Amino acid sequence: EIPKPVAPAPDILRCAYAELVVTDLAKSRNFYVDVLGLHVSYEDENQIYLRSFEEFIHHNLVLTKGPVAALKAMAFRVRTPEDVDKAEAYYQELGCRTERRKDGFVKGIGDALRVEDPLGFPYEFFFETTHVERLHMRYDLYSAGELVRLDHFNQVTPDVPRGRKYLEDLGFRVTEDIQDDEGTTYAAWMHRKGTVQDTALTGGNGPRLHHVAFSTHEKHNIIQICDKMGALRISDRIERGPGRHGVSNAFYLYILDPDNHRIEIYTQDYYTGDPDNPTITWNVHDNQRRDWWGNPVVPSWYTEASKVLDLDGNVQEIIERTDDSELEVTIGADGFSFTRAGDEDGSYHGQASKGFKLG
Amino acid sequence: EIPKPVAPAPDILRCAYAELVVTDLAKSRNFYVDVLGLHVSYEDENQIYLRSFEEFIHHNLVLTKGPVAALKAMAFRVRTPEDVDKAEAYYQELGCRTERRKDGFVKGIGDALRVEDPLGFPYEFFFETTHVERLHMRYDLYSAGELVRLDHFNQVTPDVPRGRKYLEDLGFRVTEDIQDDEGTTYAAWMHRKGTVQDTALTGGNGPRLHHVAFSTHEKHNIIQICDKMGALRISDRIERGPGRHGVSNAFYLYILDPDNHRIEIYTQDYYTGDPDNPTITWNVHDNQRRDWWGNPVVPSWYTEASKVLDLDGNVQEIIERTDDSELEVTIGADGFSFTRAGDEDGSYHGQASKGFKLG
Amino acid sequence: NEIPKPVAPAPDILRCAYAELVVTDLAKSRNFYVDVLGLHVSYEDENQIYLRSFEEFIHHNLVLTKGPVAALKAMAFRVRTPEDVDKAEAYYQELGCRTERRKDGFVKGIGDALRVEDPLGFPYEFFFETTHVERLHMRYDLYSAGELVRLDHFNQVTPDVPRGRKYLEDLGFRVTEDIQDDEGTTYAAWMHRKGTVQDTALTGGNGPRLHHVAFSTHEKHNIIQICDKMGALRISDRIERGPGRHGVSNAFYLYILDPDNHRIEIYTQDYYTGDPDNPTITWNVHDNQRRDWWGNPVVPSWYTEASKVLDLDGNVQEIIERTDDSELEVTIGADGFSFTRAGDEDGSYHGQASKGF
Amino acid sequence: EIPKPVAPAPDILRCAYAELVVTDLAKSRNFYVDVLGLHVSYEDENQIYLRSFEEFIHHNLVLTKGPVAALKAMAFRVRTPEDVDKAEAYYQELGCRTERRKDGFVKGIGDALRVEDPLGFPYEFFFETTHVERLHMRYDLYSAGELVRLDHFNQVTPDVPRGRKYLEDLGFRVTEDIQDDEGTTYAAWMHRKGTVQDTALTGGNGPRLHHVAFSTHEKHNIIQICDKMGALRISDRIERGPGRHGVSNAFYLYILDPDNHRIEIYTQDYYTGDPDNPTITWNVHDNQRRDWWGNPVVPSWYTEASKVLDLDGNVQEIIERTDDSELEVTIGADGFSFTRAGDEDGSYHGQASKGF
Numbered sequence A, B: 001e002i003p004k005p006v007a008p009a010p011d012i013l014r015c016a017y018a019e020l021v022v023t024d025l026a027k028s029r030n031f032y033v034d035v036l037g038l039h040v041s042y043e044d045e046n047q048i049y050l051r052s053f054e055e056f057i058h059h060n061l062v063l064t065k066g067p068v069a070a071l072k073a074m075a076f077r078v079r080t081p082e083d084v085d086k087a088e089a090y091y092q093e094l095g096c097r098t099e100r101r102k103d104g105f106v107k108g109i110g111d112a113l114r115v116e117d118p119l120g121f122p123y124e125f126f127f128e129t130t131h132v133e134r135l136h137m138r139y140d141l142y143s144a145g146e147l148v149r150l151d152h153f154n155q156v157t158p159d160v161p162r163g164r165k166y167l168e169d170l171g172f173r174v175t176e177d178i179q180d181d182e183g184t185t186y187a188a189w190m191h192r193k194g195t196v197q198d199t200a201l202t203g204g205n206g207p208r209l210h211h212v213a214f215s216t217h218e219k220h221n222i223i224q225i226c227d228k229m230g231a232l233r234i235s236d237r238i239e240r241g242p243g244r245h246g247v248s249n250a251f252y253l254y255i256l257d258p259d260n261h262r263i264e265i266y267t268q269d270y271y272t273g274d275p276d277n278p279t280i281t282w283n284v285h286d287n288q289r290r291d292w293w294g295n296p297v298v299p300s301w302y303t304e305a306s307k308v309l310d311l312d313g314n315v316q317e318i319i320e321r322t323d324d325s326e327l328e329v330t331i332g333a334d335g336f337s338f339t340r341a342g343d344e345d346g347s348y349h350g351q352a353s354k355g356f357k358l359g
Numbered sequence C: 001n002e003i004p005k006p007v008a009p010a011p012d013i014l015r016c017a018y019a020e021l022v023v024t025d026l027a028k029s030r031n032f033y034v035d036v037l038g039l040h041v042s043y044e045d046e047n048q049i050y051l052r053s054f055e056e057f058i059h060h061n062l063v064l065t066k067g068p069v070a071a072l073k074a075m076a077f078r079v080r081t082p083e084d085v086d087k088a089e090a091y092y093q094e095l096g097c098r099t100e101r102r103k104d105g106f107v108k109g110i111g112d113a114l115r116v117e118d119p120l121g122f123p124y125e126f127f128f129e130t131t132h133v134e135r136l137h138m139r140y141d142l143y144s145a146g147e148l149v150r151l152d153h154f155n156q157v158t159p160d161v162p163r164g165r166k167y168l169e170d171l172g173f174r175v176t177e178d179i180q181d182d183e184g185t186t187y188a189a190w191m192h193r194k195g196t197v198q199d200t201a202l203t204g205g206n207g208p209r210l211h212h213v214a215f216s217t218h219e220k221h222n223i224i225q226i227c228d229k230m231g232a233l234r235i236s237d238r239i240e241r242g243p244g245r246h247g248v249s250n251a252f253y254l255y256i257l258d259p260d261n262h263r264i265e266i267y268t269q270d271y272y273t274g275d276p277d278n279p280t281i282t283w284n285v286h287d288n289q290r291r292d293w294w295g296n297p298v299v300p301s302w303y304t305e306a307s308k309v310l311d312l313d314g315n316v317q318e319i320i321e322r323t324d325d326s327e328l329e330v331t332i333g334a335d336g337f338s339f340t341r342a343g344d345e346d347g348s349y350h351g352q353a354s355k356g357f
Numbered sequence D: 001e002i003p004k005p006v007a008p009a010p011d012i013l014r015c016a017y018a019e020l021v022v023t024d025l026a027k028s029r030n031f032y033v034d035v036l037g038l039h040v041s042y043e044d045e046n047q048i049y050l051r052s053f054e055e056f057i058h059h060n061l062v063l064t065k066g067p068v069a070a071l072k073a074m075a076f077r078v079r080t081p082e083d084v085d086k087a088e089a090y091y092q093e094l095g096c097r098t099e100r101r102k103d104g105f106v107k108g109i110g111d112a113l114r115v116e117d118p119l120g121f122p123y124e125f126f127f128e129t130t131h132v133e134r135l136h137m138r139y140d141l142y143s144a145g146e147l148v149r150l151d152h153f154n155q156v157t158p159d160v161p162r163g164r165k166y167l168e169d170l171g172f173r174v175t176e177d178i179q180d181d182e183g184t185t186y187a188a189w190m191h192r193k194g195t196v197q198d199t200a201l202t203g204g205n206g207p208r209l210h211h212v213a214f215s216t217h218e219k220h221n222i223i224q225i226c227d228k229m230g231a232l233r234i235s236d237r238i239e240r241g242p243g244r245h246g247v248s249n250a251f252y253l254y255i256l257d258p259d260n261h262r263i264e265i266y267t268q269d270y271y272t273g274d275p276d277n278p279t280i281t282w283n284v285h286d287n288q289r290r291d292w293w294g295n296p297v298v299p300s301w302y303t304e305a306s307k308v309l310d311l312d313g314n315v316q317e318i319i320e321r322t323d324d325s326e327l328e329v330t331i332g333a334d335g336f337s338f339t340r341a342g343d344e345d346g347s348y349h350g351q352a353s354k355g356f
């Protein structure tokens, strides 16, 4: 178990941006800008800085050219400059490596702390950031698939309860989780800002980055992204969806960028800002938990995820999950799922829902 | 091959209603009225007569209690009373069994002709029908999932070109089809009213009824039907979708009623009323032809369909397809499909798209 | 002064197909129709721009032609066969109308075509032949948040609606809806060939003038987006009326004004009319939900302003003043009234418009 | 000018519920339940307790039968039970009348503090509330017009700067406001939860309640409310909209309940939770500020608002605004508004936009 520090946790506002290493910067630009419509705050021959339609901080996404595609940092904004100091003392007390840069790691961020966190993830904490034009009423720019906010990160980690306790100490409250009746936790969702999630843990070998999620205003905006990817004849880069989640109640889609980094598009989850917000626990065998309509979860969604880097820029070594696998217990050869608890009718044994089996 | 009669074809306006035999009238009522929100025009202990939100003819769907669930009639409205006489002479010249009732077969229809058509389907032709309150502005009744129109039927038949030619003689024009490079036809769509289809042919053992389709105004209406089925914990009755079609360009969903009759929900196809409306032919191996986003077609969609009755109410015998199977050539162990024609990247061999094989 | 039915058979008309609008500044008009509204270019040069909607396969739905005086130059209907163009010629000749036949068309991408000065003074075109183009209906890589997907209809201002209505009925248009009063005045009527509420429509007033051209969207949010865009471009003064729900037609709608004040309607989700006994809906002129279903007031400019039309020489047609009662005056003028519920003074408006104006 | 207390402000989470006095409980039930589809948490012969689709606290709206239709309490939830203590100390230091009930003023709320605030409004602060079934996935109940959350209140008050400074001391941050070039403020919007507003101040004679606002998921849900009210032949109870706001960027509608209490339906404003969220100031003469599409604001929107009660249940006396009137300076006989700043084309003199 990760001890609760004596030092006070930084006051975290929200997820703010990710830095992703990409191998071909031009190909990645074509995906994020030409296909998805994100707005360029800055670019040069090595990096592209991108923001969503309603953002006023400098960026929500930094694409950095490098030899090995990976998550370089997942960044959280904190409430005050002094919270960056608090972060540094907190992670030092945890025994983690930290690096402080008074003028930032990436353009448009000021004083910043990066840490190798206890789960092996590269977190950044910052307050200072260069404000840019907020494009929230620039309907002359608005795309039929417009990405309006950054919503969350999702992390793959082998021991979910261990990670959960550490994030709870850091001030994230769990909104929903998936468990079974044998004491195993498969996933958890946790928040600072008043939505379902700012980050989330998915059980599996890690550290790896499962996805970054962006919001739209409406469900039809997500449908348009699918439609556009069909017209561009890149429907093979639609991994999963579109769907309605059980967990979060959001409408959703998962797509894959040119380095296989997974992006979720997401809308219309609910308010979580009250401190006694009810925590929802789903059973891992409930076939409406991930897709509410019962559509099967593709196996790649469980097995594939991005590398993450350490502070030197080297890939973090992967630690194998020993807890039960969600894939195996639901859609694998000895798996089980139900539509109605206690009913054999609409249940699935050793295969996925809707007439499919594992490839 | 079905010869063209000398007698003129009746002038067909549109598909108008289907009569489905159901085994448990109360459970069927719960599905069509309580789940899907169709409007009752008449009911008694034997039958429920239902209509869509914008309809002014007496009904779009008759549910008739019977021992064996089946299609009893697919009815098309003709332009004038005299067109019922034309239909009778047309089908007599084809050598088909016909039955004429001056006062109709079901309530709210007058002079009507039922036929066992050359493909073994029970067709009705009628002009006269009792008008009802057109509910198109009754927003006090409007559901989040409102079904606004009857759109089309879809028929399973073993020899698609033979059926196509017969329907062309009857004045239906082909809008889209699915073929391979070796001259096999797997499916055809054809219309009288100015939309993609009034009926459609799916290659398979037949005669069987594949589906009846209803329209909504908007895509979110279809999403709501899925969401409601999740809330009612009957997501196992969502067969396939929601999706975007390639063929037709319509947003879609397939669900299964209590007797396994398949219902499609459908919106936003295109205008076909010009006589040189361009036909569109898709290759059977194009993985965007049925779901534009490349989501896999569930095998039940290819194999399962409803029995049809003859004019005495007995089940029509099935005649096996000998042309190639769309299921087998796309998703079976020897099948394949592509995302981009000629590209191995995004192609699937011996399994379906997105990482599944057949259950 | 009835327009007598010809003995010659009517051409078989499929639908409204395109309008040719004369515009005074081509570049400004191009800005509006292409950059603001997102219509697709089928051809352009220094004198004309040819534009189509997202789902169209014929060459165009709108031609913008540079000229000295902004006006409707032609409203074009597609007919079912080449022989229908001959039928149109014989029909209008019997009506005593001026006609002009060009075997190779009046505009690019149309072939054999007849233009006529019709009995109501409007320049109608009938054609079959048209160059097919790429149908963009699945080009979601081009699709705009405000995408205009079909041409839907025209609306014509004319002084005597019954006279025009019977003429259009003889030509095969069927009336789907109208607005009347108890004293027997007709204020407006809507009529169709294709299976929607309208291909053209008559608005009572001084005419001939073109009231608007209407394009469809897929969904209501597409119309909202057009409004939002116009706010961002700081041209919200060119939003004339709406967005709303129509009473007549039940469609979601918006009216906007191009740089020459040609009015364009955006329209979605009316109903099917293809059955020959489609029930005809009559509204009372004093029903305040007949035009906007939510009872929002109709601005006076909607009733009084409309585009000039040209004769076949390119000269503006002289205007004939309506003598029948004016819808504006009987509903929102000094002696007008409307109601929310018939016979109920609560929610009625007298000598003014709804909502407090 | 209202002084900043030495005592710490309570930590306010969000607007949580309003108590409205209504004169005919059955007619108000028909409006809020049958027309608008709100969910009944509890009802008896004197009160109806209603909640939105996604709520888990006991209610968002209490309709209380009484002789004079009015706002009885606007309630905000606080982070902890101790924040109710802090609220009491805070308001006592301001010299405000307070009343504290350990078992609540209405069903489903526990220990609660009501105050007559410095602007004459009845505020409630509470933490404890009875949790109920959160209906957020009950799509078997979901209406085409579904109201999914309580969003905000809007208060009419004569001196906006005075009220603004007080709410800021209380921890509300201003997100947007409307001013002119003569130094007058006409309105301000301010928040605790990460949306544009939890309450808002509209310059005018006050204290009065301008509206209570509920959210939908999508714009079509707001359109459906309009369509339904047309079908019910109660379109005369649509006051203004639907529209897109300038201020807030939300899609909106204003309708009137049986006692003329104004309800806004609202969707798709933006995130404000960062402490340096940029404040946006509109000019009062900008004809896109309230309706982005330039549609005219009906005079009744500026002049009509609900009475509010004091802690004894008596109507609060109204104090006259002496600052310039938004109505008069934009749409009155000497009013002015513009589409484009500095452009005479698309400007309006002595009248409202669009031709009225």
Ligand SMILES: O=C(O)Cc1ccc(O)c(O)c1
Residues within 6 Å of the ligand: C155, C214, C246, C247, C248, C249, C251, C265, C267, C290, C291, C292
């Ligand atoms: O004015 C109204 O609102 C009625 C009406 C209905 C349909 C239309 O297309 C139109 O232009 C006008």
Ligand SMILES: [Cl-]
Residues within 6 Å of the ligand: A245, A289, A290, A291
């Ligand atoms: Cl999921």
Ligand SMILES: [Cl-]
Residues within 6 Å of the ligand: B245, B289, B290, B291
């Ligand atoms: Cl299909």
Ligand SMILES: [Cl-]
Residues within 6 Å of the ligand: D245, D289, D290, D291
């Ligand atoms: Cl406003």
Ligand SMILES: [Fe+2]
Residues within 6 Å of the ligand: A152, A153, A154, A200, A211, A213, A264
């Ligand atoms: Fe996620």
Ligand SMILES: [Fe+2]
Residues within 6 Å of the ligand: B152, B153, B154, B200, B211, B213, B264
């Ligand atoms: Fe179909």
Ligand SMILES: [Fe+2]
Residues within 6 Å of the ligand: C153, C154, C155, C201, C212, C214, C265
């Ligand atoms: Fe129109």
Ligand SMILES: [Fe+2]
Residues within 6 Å of the ligand: D152, D154, D200, D211, D213, D264
């Ligand atoms: Fe408001």
